[PDB]
Amino acid sequence: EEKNYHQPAILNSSALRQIAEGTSISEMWQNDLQPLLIERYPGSPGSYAARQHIMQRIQRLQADWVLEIDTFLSQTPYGYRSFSNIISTLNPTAKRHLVLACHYDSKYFNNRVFVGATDSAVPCAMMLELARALDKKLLSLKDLSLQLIFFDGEEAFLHWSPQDSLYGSRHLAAKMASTPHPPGARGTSQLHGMDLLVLLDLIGAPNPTFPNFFPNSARWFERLQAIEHELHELGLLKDHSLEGRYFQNYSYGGVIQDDHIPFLRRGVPVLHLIPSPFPEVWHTMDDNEENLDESTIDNLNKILQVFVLEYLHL
Ligand SMILES: *[C@@H]1O[C@H](CO)[C@@H](O[C@@H]2O[C@H](CO)[C@@H](O)[C@H](O)[C@H]2NC(C)=O)[C@H](O)[C@H]1NC(C)=O
Ligand SMILES: [Cl-]
Ligand SMILES: [Zn+2]
User: Fold this and answer.
1) 178 in ligand 1 pocket by Cβ < 6 Å?
2) For residues 295 and 207, what is the distance between their CA atoms, to the nearest angstrom?
3) Which of the residues 1, 95, 285, 301 has an alpha carbon 20 to 30 A from that of 7?
């Protein structure tokens, strides 16, 4: 309905510089990102500490985020285990929400530990830094708002299959599909109030190239392209080339499995910020803090924060 005709309020140069300046890559690194770089596969003590970190960093902000933990047991190749997706919503009774999402588990695995630095500590920390950098503007919103989702159990425990993967997202898309929205309404569920799902995944590697995956989000991907482009021209990006842009005029010809899968196949539009090709380090012990690129991530935070403000008209 409205989602289909919704237009961004495009911000001027002055307002661009403000967004570029009001985000801190170093704050994100030390306060949002470093505490997540721990083994945190589903049900582990590392999972719990990560969950606690996420909630804590969320609670500390004046915007009136409403947190909710969707916990549940699912059969795994290692028997029943516990999962906990984390939902942070502003204005939970607002009809429409822009949704941001990462998976916050790490994949269960040299006498080294897998910490999924791109996969996906960085996407989560970016979500966190967005919530902090925009706090004051998000505070004003207190019938479209913002939701953050951190999915648990994205990864296969053993071998990626329909039943061994995406435990978090598949359980939550279904919860949301059978839950009336707004509360005490008839016919319409919580998925239906999902304007757009923007899934960040595998972000942090140098020189990422993000395809335009879905016609029904193509105009939103376009907005990312114009945004990168304008932040670039204003000298607000770092180590940034037009020839090496993140957001390319490229469509993708395969199907990627990820947390958007159970929302997409129920008709939620998806803007899938996963690069192709996948980072050199993907599903290797090398996916660590060392192999991450500061300026890339700093840059994408600014593209992303602008995208978000424009969508919310903020
Ligand atoms: C570009 O956009 C910004 C939006 O932030 C404009 O600044 C606003 O100007 C109006 C008009 O007086 C004020 O009500 C707001 O208080 C201003 N906002 C802020 C955050 O300062 C800015 O004037 C616009 N500039 C141009 C050249 O178009
Ligand atoms: Cl465990
Ligand atoms: Zn992965």
Assistant:
1) no
2) 10
3) 301
Active-site residue identified among 129, 152, 195, 201? 201
State this model's resolution in angstroms: 2.1
**For 188, phi and psi rounded to 5 degrees?**
-115, 135
* List of domains in the chain: 1-314 (3.40.630.10)
Q: Helix, strand, coil % (nearest 5) of the chain? A: 35, 20, 45
Residue 97 pairs in a beta bridge with: 145, 194
Nearest to 307 by CA among 213, 299, 244, 201: 299
Nearest-angstrom CA–CA distance, 112 and 258 = 25
Say which experimental method was used: X-ray
Strands (E), 96-193: 96-103, 144-151
* Backbone region of residue 283 per phi and psi (left: phi > 0; alpha: psi in -120 to 50; beta: other values): left
Region for residue 144 given its phi and psi (left: phi exceeds 0; alpha: psi -120 to 50; beta: otherwise): beta
Q: What are the φ and ψ backbone dihedral angles of 202, each rounded to 5 degrees? A: 60, 45
Q: Please work out whether the CB of residue 15 comes within 6 Å of at least one atom of ligand 1.
A: yes
What's the CA-to-centroid distance between 2 and ligand 1, angstroms?
A: 27
Taking the CA of 79 as reference, the closest ligand is: 2
Nearest to 146 by CA among 256, 51, 231, 61: 61
Ligand 1, residues 10, 12, 16, 313: which to mutate, most atoms within 8 A of Cβ? 12
